[PDB]
Amino acid sequence: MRIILLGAPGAGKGTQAQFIMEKYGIPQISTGDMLRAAVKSGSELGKQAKDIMDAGKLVTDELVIALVKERIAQEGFLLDGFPRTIPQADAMKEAGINVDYVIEFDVPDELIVDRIVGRRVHAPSGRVYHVKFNPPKVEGKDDVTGEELTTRKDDQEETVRKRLVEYHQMTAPLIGYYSKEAEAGNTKYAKVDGTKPVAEVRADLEKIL
Incomplete structure (x- = not known):
């Protein structure tokens, strides 16, 4: 099973990637x-x-x-x-x-x-x-190793704004690209509402997959 996750910075792709990885034994290529x-x-x-x-x-x-x-x-x-x-x-x-x-x-x-x-x-x-x-099960700690969580260097508001502009300029056109691919029978295309809670997006992905 080969899957592409598409979406804006912060849409929840990596969060859902973990669940698909630990279920279908599908490695995350992030x-x-x-x-x-x-x-x-x-x-x-x-x-x-x-x-x-x-x-x-x-x-x-x-x-x-x-x-x-x-x-x-x-x-x-x-x-x-x-x-x-x-x-x-x-x-x-x-x-x-x-x-x-x-x-x-x-x-x-x-x-x-x-x-x-x-x-x-x-x-x-x-x-x-x-x-x-x-949230983590213990505030500020990784659930598995117990190590103090960090903030990514690039998660400052200024850098996120810039990432979202580059996404609309360079990445959003892939929606059209892969929709045409699905129209030609080369792949399945599905859309999920990324505003739902983590648990519901997970179940939506299990229905699709």
Whole structure:
């Protein structure tokens, strides 16, 4: 089972990715987690992402396409934050990487900033929380390791605004792209209401999947 999750910054893609991973045994391929990993470990394929991610900008198509091809070689899958541009989507289709399901998370722009201000992460695992809407079982702590949660460098309101602009400029056109793919019989397309509670979005995804 090959799945693409599509949606604005903060739509809840990674939150739902965890549930699909721990159910259908489908590995999460989070380009965002992989680039943050490669920055910390100074890795050749990604270490260059640091200033771009701090700016709220997209990393170059060719770097992430290489990153994804490499990670794919080592495996079903769930693509989370890739593709992010038409040229990334075209690269998957040119390399014959077909998917069974494309799932669009619909969340109004007006929720995103206010949403991401509450985001807390366990960097080592990529588990993510929200201080109000999906809190850890113990305030400030990872549920599994008990380690103090952190705030991502790029989750400052200014950087989120910039990320949401780049999403509408560069990424939102993938909605049309994969809808045409579904129209040609190449994949299933489904939309989920990302404003519902975490639990309901999870059940909506189980109905689709």
